[PDB]
Design a protein around this ligand. Structure first.
Ligand code: NA
Length: 240
């Protein structure tokens, strides 16, 4: 997250770190959201590679013991059936991961609340992106969980020529684009939390930014719109 600030350790209890085994160690690769005690939602493009993955919940500092982490293997990966790796702009950038064991809920570990199906945010709605992604274009991952305030940009605007044009679809949400704050590598799969009727819900799964850098004016971060996929999510979980 570029232009972010350190999150309080109990602000975003549905946030997870997806990590892969790298030699003798594990390394953070993207974010995601806990949606059942044994299911995680992330971006499809995060699990494109044939790696060994684990999920870490209750994480705050990637490089120190926080005393709150639970580590759990990924048992099954279900990517959206329409997803196509060489066409992120077509959408369907979403995947569910079944965990090997169910995690225990506490003040650091909670289920993410999803929006009702079909819900669309008005232009300029207040949202926070959270994650451990790069803190500058071509930079390094954050140690501690970061958050940034990124107001939504509605489809009519973000699909106009000076923004994303037809690369953005109605199945997506855009947020940010002020040139100071944005998502960045390592944030993919992570949540966009928006305050609706007094309650934060996860409205987006971070999907892509502009190859011209993370924080670029009029290239808001693009997220998969979770409220477009409520039935898909229910169906997968009901059938697995
Ligand atoms: Na830690």
């Amino acid at each position: 997250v570029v232009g972010g600030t350190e999150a309080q350790r109990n602000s975003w209890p549905s946030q997870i770190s997806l990590q892969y085994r790298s030699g003798s160690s594990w390394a953070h690769t993207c974010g995601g959201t806990l949606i059942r005690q044994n299911w995680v939602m992330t971006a499809a493009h995060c699990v494109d590679r044939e790696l060994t993955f684990r999920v870490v919940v209750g994480e705050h500092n990637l490089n120190q013991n926080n005393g709150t982490e639970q580590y759990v293997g990924v048992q099954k990966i279900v990517v959206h059936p329409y997803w196509n790796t060489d066409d992120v702009a077509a959408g369907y950038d979403i995947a569910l991961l079944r965990l090997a064991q169910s995690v225990t809920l506490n003040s650091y570990v909670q289920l993410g609340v999803l929006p009702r199906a079909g819900t669309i945010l008005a232009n300029n709605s207040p949202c926070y992106i959270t994650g451990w992604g790069l803190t500058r274009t071509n930079g390094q991952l954050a140690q501690t969980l970061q958050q940034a305030y990124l107001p939504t940009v509605d489809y009519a605007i973000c699909s106009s020529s000076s923004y994303w044009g037809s690369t953005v679809k109605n199945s997506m949400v855009c947020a940010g684009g002020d040139g100071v704050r944005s998502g960045c590598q390592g944030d993919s799969g992570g949540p966009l939390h928006c305050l609706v009727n007094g309650q934060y819900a996860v409205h987006g799964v971070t999907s892509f930014v502009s190859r011209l850098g993370c924080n670029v004016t009029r290239k808001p971060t693009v997220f998969t719109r979770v409220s477009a996929y409520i039935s898909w999510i229910n169906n997968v979980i009901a059938s697995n």
